[PDB]
Swiss-Prot record, chain A:
Pfam families: Ribosomal_L32p. Belongs to the bacterial ribosomal protein bL32 family. The gene is rpmF. Part of the 50S ribosomal subunit. Contacts L17. This is Large ribosomal subunit protein bL32. Residues 1-37 are annotated as: Disordered. GO terms for molecular function: structural constituent of ribosome. It comes from the Bacteria.
Swiss-Prot record, chain B:
The gene is rplN. NCBIfam families: rplN_bact. The lineage of its organism: Bacteria, Pseudomonadati, Pseudomonadota, Gammaproteobacteria, Enterobacterales. One of its GO terms (cellular component) is cytosol. It comes from Escherichia coli (strain K12). SUPFAM superfamilies: Ribosomal protein L14. This is Large ribosomal subunit protein uL14. Gene3D superfamilies: Ribosomal protein L14.
From Swiss-Prot, chain C:
It holds the Pfam family Ribosomal_L17. This is Large ribosomal subunit protein bL17. Belongs to the bacterial ribosomal protein bL17 family. InterPro entries: Ribosomal_bL17, Ribosomal_bL17_CS, Ribosomal_bL17_sf. Keywords: Ribonucleoprotein, Ribosomal protein. PROSITE patterns: RIBOSOMAL_L17. Requires L15 for assembly into the 50S subunit. Signal peptide: none annotated. NCBIfam families: L17. The lineage of its organism: Bacteria, Pseudomonadati, Pseudomonadota, Gammaproteobacteria, Enterobacterales. It comes from the Bacteria. Part of the 50S ribosomal subunit. Contacts protein L32. The keyword Metal-binding does not apply. The keyword Thylakoid does not apply. The gene is rplQ. It comes from Escherichia coli (strain K12).
Length: 56, 122, 120
RNA sequence: AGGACCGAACCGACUAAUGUUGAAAAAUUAGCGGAUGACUUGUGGCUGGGGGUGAAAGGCCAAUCAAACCGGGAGAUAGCU
RNA sequence: GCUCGCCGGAAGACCAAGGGUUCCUGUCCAACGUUAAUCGGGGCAGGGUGAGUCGACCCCUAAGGCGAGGCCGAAAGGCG
RNA sequence: ACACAGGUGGUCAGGUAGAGAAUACCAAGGCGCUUGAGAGAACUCGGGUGAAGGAACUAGGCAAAAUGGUGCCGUAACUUCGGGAGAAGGCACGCUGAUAUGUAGGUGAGGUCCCUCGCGGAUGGAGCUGAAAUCAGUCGAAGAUACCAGCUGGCUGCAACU
RNA sequence: AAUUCCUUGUCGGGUAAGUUCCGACCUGCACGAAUGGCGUAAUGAUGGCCAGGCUGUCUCCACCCGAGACUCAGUGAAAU
RNA sequence: GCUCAACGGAUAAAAGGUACUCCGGGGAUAACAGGCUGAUACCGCCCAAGAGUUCAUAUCGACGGCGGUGUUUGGCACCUCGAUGUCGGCUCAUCACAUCCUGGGGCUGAAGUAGGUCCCAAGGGUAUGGCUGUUCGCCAUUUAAAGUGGUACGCGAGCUGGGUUUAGAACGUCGUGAGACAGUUCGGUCCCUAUCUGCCGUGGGCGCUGGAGAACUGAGGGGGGCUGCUCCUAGUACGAGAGGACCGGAGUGGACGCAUCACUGGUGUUCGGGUUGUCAUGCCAAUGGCACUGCCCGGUAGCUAAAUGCGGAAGAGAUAAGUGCUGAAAGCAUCUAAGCACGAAACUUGCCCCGAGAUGAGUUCUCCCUGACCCUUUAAGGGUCCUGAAGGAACGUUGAAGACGACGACGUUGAUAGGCCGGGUGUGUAAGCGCAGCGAUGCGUUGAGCUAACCGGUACUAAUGAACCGUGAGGCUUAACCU
């Protein structure tokens, strides 16, 4: 019905061996700037596809 | 559909306005009756001068139902107002001296095949 | 599964979604740019582009539109003279979607949705 | 005219829908008898523990009742755990 | 600010009983506030409720309490 | 004990629908319930619609569904004469314009006439409010069109009812 | 019979069949006169039964719309 | 000098109730279950009075006896006082065989159709309702079987609350009484987010030895296997005679498993049309917001059974009981000893699906890459550079796939998603205009108008170049042949 023995610190690691939702994997290159961005996403500084859009 | 507790009219004479359907029988898991399927029936109001009496249990066949009959070609021939014919269990054939409604010829099993040999235009 | 359903279910009741998209599509004509979420913005093209294409046909019997579907009370005085004559001729594609990733420290897929202001 | 109908508040609690480490240690949702009468209810007062009160169930008296709580007798007594 | 929805015998509006700073608006956002926080009965500073006619006090008083002298009970206490 | 659906007395009241303090929609006024974005899975909880049979389901019509308004008709046995009674059962229902560009009932005046010329003393019946009837047309498959809003007959035991 | 041992009696009616329903039998193993007996209407948070109306309770499930469940992110309990 | 007699004298002097009980404890002590037992029991047999016209054994069986079983009736008290919740039902099967239906062989007092009835076997198959809590017993109606049994006498971290069952209470009866009846009647509570084994589906790491892409073998596993009634084969077989059958089929029904959306209805809150209430739009035409999608009616795409389709094979192999040949030991007799055959509804191959972690990891085809240097406390590590193929994945547009991953398309060498411009099914001729009409409204333009899944065209808008992973002919031993 309930826990009668505590799971091991090996079992803890067996349940954290796939824990990364993001690795994070390699970036993509721009087209008018020496800058790089996330695959199919505009940077927080506005860089994407040589357009430099909605920058701050 | 014609199932348990169904209250319906008789197609033979002397049976009166009401008889009750009390299980289909003839095999495992038998529910609902189609045209020419034999059902078990009980008599409740039958005319005193007729061959049958109240509370005596008989065999009957469905002659009218809105599921109709489609065996000949796949097109459904349908009937308004659920009705049954009363069958002899030992000597075979229907038990009345008259029959009501226009009727059908698809009732072709030899134990009731005499139905086409009566006063109707079928 | 979902049998034949091809439109996505997003967030809130279908009644709240109806009014939120009605309010966002009419207001984007005056704001020119809106900041919102990617799944929401990907379904905005389905209601804001036909609202601009509504000015493509010219008739005295076309001015009573945008009153039963996608109501807005202020575009109905300017849109037929402004975007109807040359822009609405292209019958779609007026929108740009800007995928921006995270908004802050939370999990929401942030997007900006804007209208094209010059065709050439 | 009414210890009368249908029916809210106002009184009850015959029920099902949920809850059951609850939203809540007695509640919620939807129906339902009583509904001007032996009606219902606010405020203030009086009744106390083997004592009170009850159109009466061994029911009610600060979650306990074949007898609610506290300080003291008190470190009561336990062929027993 | 706009547009949309919800309540509308209330989820609007005016008060008692009780609570005792919680109202009003200036600043911070270390700590507290099952999300952010530039906001909050939070941290911190200040401002706030004025009566001859409302109520008490004041004048009566139902139930009832307290109750001289006197009485009951060893006394305490009680009756009246 | 909790930014706890629980407990808590007085005071005021509206369009339209409604007999209503029920209930639907809404005005004045108030508020968006102090985690967010998506997926569209069984399953659990809550809702919607359903053919032809029908209580067969189940200890058992429990539960759920149907009915449900008003006017005009029609009304059993049993009975302590008071009841039973809503017995049971039937028929109808929107809209148009005309008589009257709104009839009669309620309300009621310019005017007319009188006297003690005035919170005056009569009278006529415009203005306001406005049934219902009569006649003739018209539409949907459906007119009580939404909310709101009846299961009935017939025995037996217990209990007089409140 | 709310009382019944044989007893779910016996028999007539009601069912397809009824340990139940209504009535009749007397042989009440143990009804019976205020310790109350017999008896009827409206009524009744009333036990049992017959018929109809109306019905997804069932035949037999089938499709439709939400919340929780599912995925990530936020702030993060319990018996054991 | 005490029936102080409970006698070794508890006080001179004392009975009951607890369903209102409380406390200290308990298998020292109870009902169920598992085991233990098998007197009892069920099942079969040895004996065979006597029955069966005659006749013991076709079919039965006395007076008595044995064996098998775990199996009823009843015992032991070894597992329960820190709890294996009470009877039946529904759900759900699964094992046995002393075989119920199916098969195989046989005696019959079996001439034939039926009937009576015993060995051999576990592949396939074996009813619902009434009163009643009752499964059951009784009954009604049905079977090829509704077989005889085991499963904690199969049912609660699965359900209902009717039996059982207190605290309200009554009827009958008993017990002065307080309480009492596995008598009777109304009424009377049903808690539970999973640690791991058991399971179902599904990711990631590792193995199969250069990398990559894929199709084939088949160690072994599972599925298929049943049948009522009638009609034909057949008035043929048999038998005075009446009557009346095998093989193998068909007609009509069923269990069970398996697949579809063409039929047909239903549903279909992304499509259309009508309509009640009320607020908004100045008001009206007309159209939204809310009212169970407010209400009412059709219905595409799709689901679905309330609809439609379908099934247990031949050849080859091998098998209890049974059918056996030639034949000895034991001149004969014998299926067995030497020697060798037949055969069941069962079963292996064959068919249909899985399957090389078959670590015994098998096969074969299609595709690709032909590289160096420094240091050392090194027969091994740590650094740098050249050059990365064939391919795979992420990242996207998403779906015939889906809880999440996985996986089927398509990423400009593009039809993958969305949109536009149409068509189609579906709805039903609108909002306008013209005329007629007191007007509601009708008719004509108009088969109008509207649309989502079905169908077509289209790059209109979006799926960027790259970047990333994947490396340079691929470890060890043996044999033969040519050299």
């Amino acid at each position: 019905a309930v826990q009668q023995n505590k799971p091991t610190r090996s079992k803890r690691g067996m349940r954290r061996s796939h824990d990364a939702l993001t690795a994070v994997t390699s970036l993509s290159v721009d087209k008018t700037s020496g800058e790089k961005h996330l695959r199919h996403h505009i940077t927080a500084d506005g860089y994407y596809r040589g357009r430099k859009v909605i920058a701050k | 559909m014609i199932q348990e507790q169904t209250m319906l009219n008789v197609a033979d004479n002397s049976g009166a306005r009401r008889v009750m359907c009390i299980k289909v029988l003839g095999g495992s898991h038998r529910r609902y009756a189609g045209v020419g399927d034999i059902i078990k029936i009980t008599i409740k109001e039958a005319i005193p001068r007729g061959k049958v009496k109240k509370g005596d249990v008989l065999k009957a066949v469905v002659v009218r139902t809105k599921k109709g009959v489609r065996r000949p070609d796949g097109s459904v021939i349908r009937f308004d107002g659920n009705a049954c014919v009363l069958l002899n269990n030992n000597s075979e054939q229907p038990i009345g001296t008259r029959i009501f409604g226009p009727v059908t010829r698809e009732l072709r099993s030899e134990k009731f095949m005499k139905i086409i040999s009566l006063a109707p235009e079928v | 599964m979902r049998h034949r359903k091809s439109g996505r279910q997003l967030n809130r009741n279908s009644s709240h979604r109806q009014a939120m998209f009605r309010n966002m599509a009419g207001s984007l004509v005056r704001h020119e740019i809106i900041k919102t979420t990617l799944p929401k913005a990907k379904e905005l093209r389905r209601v804001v582009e036909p609202l601009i294409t509504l000015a493509k046909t010219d008739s005295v019997a076309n001015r009573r539109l945008a009153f039963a579907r996608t109501r807005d009370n202020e575009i109905v005085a300017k849109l037929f003279n402004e975007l109807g004559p040359r822009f609405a001729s292209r019958a779609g594609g007026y929108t740009r979607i800007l995928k921006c990733g995270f908004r802050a420290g939370d999990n929401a897929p942030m997007a900006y949705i804007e209208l094209v202001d010059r065709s050439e």
